Design a protein around this ligand. Sequence first.
Ligand code: FDE
Length: 184
Amino acid sequence: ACTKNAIAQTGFNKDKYFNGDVWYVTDYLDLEPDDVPKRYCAALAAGTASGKLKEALYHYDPKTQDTFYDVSELQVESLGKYTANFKKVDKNGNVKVAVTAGNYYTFTVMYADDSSALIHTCLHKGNKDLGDLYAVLNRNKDAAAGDKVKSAVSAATLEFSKFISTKENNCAYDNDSLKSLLTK
Ligand code: FDE
């Protein structure tokens, strides 16, 4: 189960974060660490599409090759904190699993600048038991975490040393499909 009420960035700039571009997960921390593999690839696009706040997600397990994309229209709880009922889609936006009740994640932007961010998520999916998952994001898939985002990790009373890097997994991303999925 999730246990954290993550605090959104003071002065969060929504239009900059939700600009239609891609964010790569470079490091992550699950508080129930067996919930996610030790090796992983994820990325997201975030933007407004025809007036609707959207995210598109990509997950890839570099060992098993399990792949999936998702799309959500985000609802606002407050500036920088969102709830997102998701649908599983192929890379072209064709629905594989429809939106339903009980399938949603919360999403809080704890820190962001133009190039890096720290988020918290809490996934709810059916009867699964999932925990708090923090992710360091960058606009450049290869960027080492800089001092601004690492300081934000400390300010959330977390230790960056505990985060697991995605950088040694040979992750390759389809940026084009993430951007187009925003419209779907
Ligand atoms: C490492 C990592 C990282 C991440 C990130 C993320 C973010 C930022 C967000 C998210 C979300 C999500 N996820 Fe995530 N992630 C991960 C992981 C994961 C996994 C393993 C899974 C599967 C689960 C189950 O089903 O059990 C997921 C999962 C997930 C999901 C679901 C999808 C479907 O369709 O089913 C979602 C919605 N993810 N995510």
